[PDB]
Design a protein around this motif. Sequence first.
Motif, PDB file in Angstrom:
ATOM      1  N   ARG A   1       0.866  -1.151   0.000  1.00  0.00           N
ATOM      2  CA  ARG A   1       0.000   0.000   0.000  1.00  0.00           C
ATOM      3  C   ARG A   1       0.909   1.209   0.000  1.00  0.00           C
ATOM      4  NH1 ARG A   1      -2.770   4.843   1.610  1.00  0.00           N
ATOM      5  NH2 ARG A   1      -5.011   4.372   1.698  1.00  0.00           N
ATOM      6  N   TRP A   2       0.783   2.045  -1.017  1.00  0.00           N
ATOM      7  CA  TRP A   2       1.574   3.259  -1.114  1.00  0.00           C
ATOM      8  C   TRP A   2       1.030   4.308  -0.151  1.00  0.00           C
ATOM      9  CZ3 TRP A   2       6.090   4.145  -2.937  1.00  0.00           C
ATOM     10  CH2 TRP A   2       6.509   5.464  -3.168  1.00  0.00           C
ATOM     11  N   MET A   3       1.679   4.438   0.999  1.00  0.00           N
ATOM     12  CA  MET A   3       1.290   5.421   2.012  1.00  0.00           C
ATOM     13  C   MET A   3       1.431   6.866   1.545  1.00  0.00           C
ATOM     14  SD  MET A   3       0.422   4.292   5.224  1.00  0.00           S
ATOM     15  CE  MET A   3      -0.973   3.692   4.281  1.00  0.00           C
ATOM     16  N   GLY A   4       2.346   7.110   0.614  1.00  0.00           N
ATOM     17  CA  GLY A   4       2.483   8.417  -0.007  1.00  0.00           C
ATOM     18  C   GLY A   4       3.926   8.864  -0.133  1.00  0.00           C
ATOM     19  N   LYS A   5       4.153   9.738  -1.110  1.00  0.00           N
ATOM     20  CA  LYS A   5       5.432  10.395  -1.325  1.00  0.00           C
ATOM     21  C   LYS A   5       5.511  11.597  -0.385  1.00  0.00           C
ATOM     22  CE  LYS A   5       7.864  12.751  -5.121  1.00  0.00           C
ATOM     23  NZ  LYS A   5       7.427  14.131  -4.764  1.00  0.00           N
ATOM     24  N   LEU A   6       6.616  11.704   0.347  1.00  0.00           N
ATOM     25  CA  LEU A   6       6.847  12.791   1.290  1.00  0.00           C
ATOM     26  C   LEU A   6       7.906  13.733   0.742  1.00  0.00           C
ATOM     27  CD1 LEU A   6       7.220  10.709   4.561  1.00  0.00           C
ATOM     28  CD2 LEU A   6       5.119  11.782   3.652  1.00  0.00           C
ATOM     29  N   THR A   7       7.483  14.877   0.216  1.00  0.00           N
ATOM     30  CA  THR A   7       8.424  15.931  -0.153  1.00  0.00           C
ATOM     31  C   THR A   7       8.729  16.776   1.092  1.00  0.00           C
ATOM     32  OG1 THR A   7       8.999  17.550  -1.891  1.00  0.00           O
ATOM     33  CG2 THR A   7       6.781  17.780  -0.903  1.00  0.00           C
ATOM     34  N   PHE A   8      10.017  17.010   1.341  1.00  0.00           N
ATOM     35  CA  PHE A   8      10.478  17.937   2.367  1.00  0.00           C
ATOM     36  C   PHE A   8      11.376  18.963   1.694  1.00  0.00           C
ATOM     37  CE2 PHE A   8       9.958  13.949   4.747  1.00  0.00           C
ATOM     38  CZ  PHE A   8       9.209  14.385   5.822  1.00  0.00           C
ATOM     39  N   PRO A   9      10.965  20.241   1.662  1.00  0.00           N
ATOM     40  CA  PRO A   9      11.823  21.229   1.004  1.00  0.00           C
ATOM     41  C   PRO A   9      13.101  21.506   1.792  1.00  0.00           C
ATOM     42  CG  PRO A   9      10.083  22.345   2.176  1.00  0.00           C
ATOM     43  CD  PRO A   9       9.803  20.875   2.313  1.00  0.00           C
TER      44      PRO A   9
ATOM     45  N   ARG B   1       4.841  15.550   8.522  1.00  0.00           N
ATOM     46  CA  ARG B   1       3.975  14.906   7.560  1.00  0.00           C
ATOM     47  C   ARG B   1       3.258  13.757   8.231  1.00  0.00           C
ATOM     48  NH1 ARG B   1       5.270  18.730   5.649  1.00  0.00           N
ATOM     49  NH2 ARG B   1       6.369  19.242   3.701  1.00  0.00           N
TER      50      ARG B   1
END
Lengths: 367, 367, 50, 52
Positions: free
Chosen positions: D36-44, D52
């Motif tokens: 299950r793809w929990m999500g992509k986490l972008t951190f600038p 997140r």
Amino acid sequence: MEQNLFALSLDDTSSVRGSLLDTKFAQTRVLLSKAMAGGDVLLDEYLYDVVNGQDFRATVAFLRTHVITGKIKVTATTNISDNSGCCLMLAINSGVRGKYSTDVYTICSQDSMTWNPGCKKNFSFTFNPNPCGDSWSAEMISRSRVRMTVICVSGWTLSPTTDVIAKLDWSIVNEKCEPTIYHLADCQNWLPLNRWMGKLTFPQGVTSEVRRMPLSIGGGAGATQAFLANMPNSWISMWRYFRGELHFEVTKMSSPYIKATVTFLIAFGNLSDAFGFYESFPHRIVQFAEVEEKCTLVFSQQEFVTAWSTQVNPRTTLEADGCPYLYAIIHDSTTGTISGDFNLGVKLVGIKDFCGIGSNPGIDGSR
Amino acid sequence: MEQNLFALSLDDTSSVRGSLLDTKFAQTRVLLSKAMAGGDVLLDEYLYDVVNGQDFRATVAFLRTHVITGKIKVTATTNISDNSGCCLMLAINSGVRGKYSTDVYTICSQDSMTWNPGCKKNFSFTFNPNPCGDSWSAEMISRSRVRMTVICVSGWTLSPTTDVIAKLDWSIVNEKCEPTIYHLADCQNWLPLNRWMGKLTFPQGVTSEVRRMPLSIGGGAGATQAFLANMPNSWISMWRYFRGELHFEVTKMSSPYIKATVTFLIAFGNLSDAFGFYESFPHRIVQFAEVEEKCTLVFSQQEFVTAWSTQVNPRTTLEADGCPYLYAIIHDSTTGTISGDFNLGVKLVGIKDFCGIGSNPGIDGSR
Amino acid sequence: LEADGCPYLYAIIHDSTTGTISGDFNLGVKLVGIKDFCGIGSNPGIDGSR
Amino acid sequence: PTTDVIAKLDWSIVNEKCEPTIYHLADCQNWLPLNRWMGKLTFPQGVTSEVR
């Protein structure tokens, strides 16, 4: 049901203890500016003021425990791309006095971690905030006014895009608080010093770069019309002449991209620059890999005939000075695809099998 | 030195643990007014709001530990001169619904300590805030909205000079959280109830005072055009008829100075007042000393021929009612040098060797 | 978020995101699976996601 | 990169056993795979507190 309250375990005087989660008592947020220079105070506060406005598991235990047998661990998570690198130094001193010097020389002495973020992902070190006992407390260090100082000893060789943060994370480990006491015995197996021999900048190029550091270490480090002093360095100058196995700890402060091979050797001041037979003398070559940022040069008793003076007159020239120096000679050439010097920090850690002779009446300056 | 941060013990999921100093997580300051009456809410807040604005050793551990295997101990230090006495009851319930009743009847059920400050210097008791599991958390009880209530079931028999304070002190002990689950089996070895049979006031004098409490306990306790209900009392009324060893727990709520000897006996409603042969029946005499405030009447299976109904019609008179009562008869006379009633609280703790028969279609009221 | 009694998985930057080159610190989380899975009841269902 | 890139995929047949992966309605299971793809986490890049 009723019970006798005098019999309860509310007089638990035991130290702070457990896992690393439940001994944590503060975090601190140090800002490393995009363009920070050398000799630059990043943080400078009393060690008790670390714990102001904190709410971790051992924070209330730490403030209220009358005695603590364990050391304080501090760990600094800070990293930067291999491309760049710098040199930070966190340091604990037992106190201060008005308008104090924050030069790396002064600070180093007692208890300090020094690391290069470029090479080390994180860095930790333990210490005892009371250096003459097996125990301490929050009330001891607040009223004793123990002082913590983070300093940048070498700037960023290549600046990051944005500002950086170093998160320090203060805990209490369960190691024994061992005391570190200096004393006047002439022969000692290990006399620690943490004497900052000096930062060695080597520019990029094809020139023969030679750097001398004198081993007449006593009488402080220089300033304008002044000198700086640690205690350990003032302590060794009690004696007139001295000798021993010297344990230097040479550290890379630049990025891994600036590459240079450095010969280290003991020899006397008379030897000129543009004398291309330094490798006649016994020597150690020091290449650093990408990952290594630290190496320990040791110079045995066989490098020295006699003891030498702890202090020399500041006026004496290199031509007429009979104490040994520690040379640092670029073996080949300082290189890199990016611009920047090959900074390199030498720190006399201590003298093994120290033998101190006589009784120094003293000399005023340094060099 | 550097270290692998993924390997560290920062995933310590263990419960709160240690001495009683470092498991304490809150204190709470209840005010008992100089002139407080019976059925009078002293404190009434959610159990999570206890820990708001607190700074003890286990306070941050308590809020941040995802699971807690231990019970919550609460202890109340409160005392008053022998001369006087009252009856406080702290009580924990799994929740509430709009404009709830805070009558001792309603509250008692689940988990409660009841004590007389006049006799007990302090009083403690443990409990599991999740009654159908071996574990719980701060987030469970905040969102579940567990409710704590302190109530005064009998006022001060002799008022103190000033206001009083009861300091409650919330900790986490290391006893196992055992669950208390009611179920529909007909025969059960121990069916707990904590059914408040009623407060028995006996005035000072020479009159023959008799007090009947019916053992048709089912169908709640009375009100105006209403009835009050616990769960355990609603649970026993599932069954039509029932029997067992009844374990009452009679408590003194007055001061030690008001003295009276009380005969307890099972018998039927038809027996009149001014019938002076109550001691023909089998009975138990109950004198209280100065220090004792609590005694456990048990009525075996030999006191009852058959099972009796859990509910009776509210209209049925004492003359025509075939279920047993529990009489409480003043044996001699209620006395004291100070004015005040001899208050006395009877609480059916539970039925041992419970046997529930049939299936109650139900009756509306109580009595 | 204020009224939701199920657990979340937080991901918090401990110190600071850094680099000599510009670009985000992308990071992908993927629940591989549940060990010792225990499923209770029978979901009548809810329409959306979040 | 300076230019376009190529990923060369190379399809073979190994001699591992083809094990089947079947989902079923038992309440208790030792391993329920999901991916299950929990999500992509972008951190600038920066100094801000990113959660997140």
